[PDB]
């Protein structure tokens, strides 16, 4: 009964955001709560933020 089929492939880039799940290899899992601005992050004596 099928006359024809059109398959459309959509590519979407998912950027990281709060609510996404991150984890290490050690079982340390968590959910992102906030996207902190670069100037708000803790930084070292050389000014490099984490």
């Amino acid at each position: 009964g099928v006359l024809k089929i059109v398959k459309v492939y959509l590519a979407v880039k998912r950027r990281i955001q709060p609510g996404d799940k991150m984890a290490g290899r050690h079982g340390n899992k968590g959910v992102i709560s906030k996207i902190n601005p670069i100037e708000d992050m803790p930084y070292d004596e050389n000014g490099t933020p984490v």
């Binding site: 601005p37 670069i38 100037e39 930084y43 000014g47 490099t48």
Partner: protein, 223 residues
């Protein structure tokens, strides 16, 4: 009553790395100004970034071009890292034409009088076929902050690039003892800045100070 700091030295360590010395500073003002200027420099400095790319024969970034080493998406990522300073206008269109085998770098971009390429060796892609040729139109816009393409509101083939307009990469500041003619309780603030080479360190410092002063105008006359 307070001694006003002055810009006394600018040590251009490299093209993208500089140190600016403010002197003299009273107690506490060194760290106050250091943190305020660090935050403003990291958040609010204006710069030119690639926002749109049009590669001939390319419909979208999730595709390949014959004779090109990199994927179109990887080419867009490389163009995102292109550092350009534009003079006298907030938007420019650069033309890149290259043929033959070899790395296609920022030096191959067509020369524009109002456009300066701070890092001509920035690799854009690689052509691996002698008959292969790449031609693209790159849109460079002036802005500030981070502006993702998805939050930005076009013929097919015009690929949007996330715009990281901020020329400032890293800011550190150190407050140390200053040698005054007669005072000993004065400090000097050394601001170490690493940029993409598209902003003058003195221009950045004056820009941040102007932003801070205009933001302080509201508090200066509270009502």
């Amino acid at each position: 009553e307070f001694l006003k700091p002055r810009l006394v030295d600018i040590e251009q360590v490299s093209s993208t790395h500089a140190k600016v010395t403010l002197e003299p500073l009273e107690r506490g003002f060194g760290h106050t100004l250091g943190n305020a200027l660090r935050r403003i420099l990291l958040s609010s400095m204006p710069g030119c970034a690639v926002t749109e790319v049009e590669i001939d024969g390319v419909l979208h970034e999730y595709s390949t071009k014959e004779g090109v080493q990199e994927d179109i998406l990887e080419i867009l990522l490389n163009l995102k890292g292109l550092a350009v300073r534009v003079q006298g206008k907030d938007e420019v269109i650069l033309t890149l034409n290259k043929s033959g085998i070899g790395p296609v770098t920022a030096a191959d971009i067509t020369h524009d009088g109002d456009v300066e390429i701070v890092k001509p060796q920035h690799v854009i892609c690689h052509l691996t076929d002698e008959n292969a040729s790449i031609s693209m139109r790159i849109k460079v816009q002036r802005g500030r902050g981070y502006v993702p393409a998805s939050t930005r509101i076009r013929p097919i083939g015009r690929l949007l690039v996330d715009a990281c307009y901020s020329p400032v990469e890293r800011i550190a500041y150190n407050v140390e003892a200053a040698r005054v003619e007669q005072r000993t309780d004065l400090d000097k603030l050394v601001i170490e800045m690493e940029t993409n080479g598209t902003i003058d360190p003195e221009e950045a410092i004056r820009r941040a100070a102007t932003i801070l002063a205009e933001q302080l105008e509201a508090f200066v006359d509270l009502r």
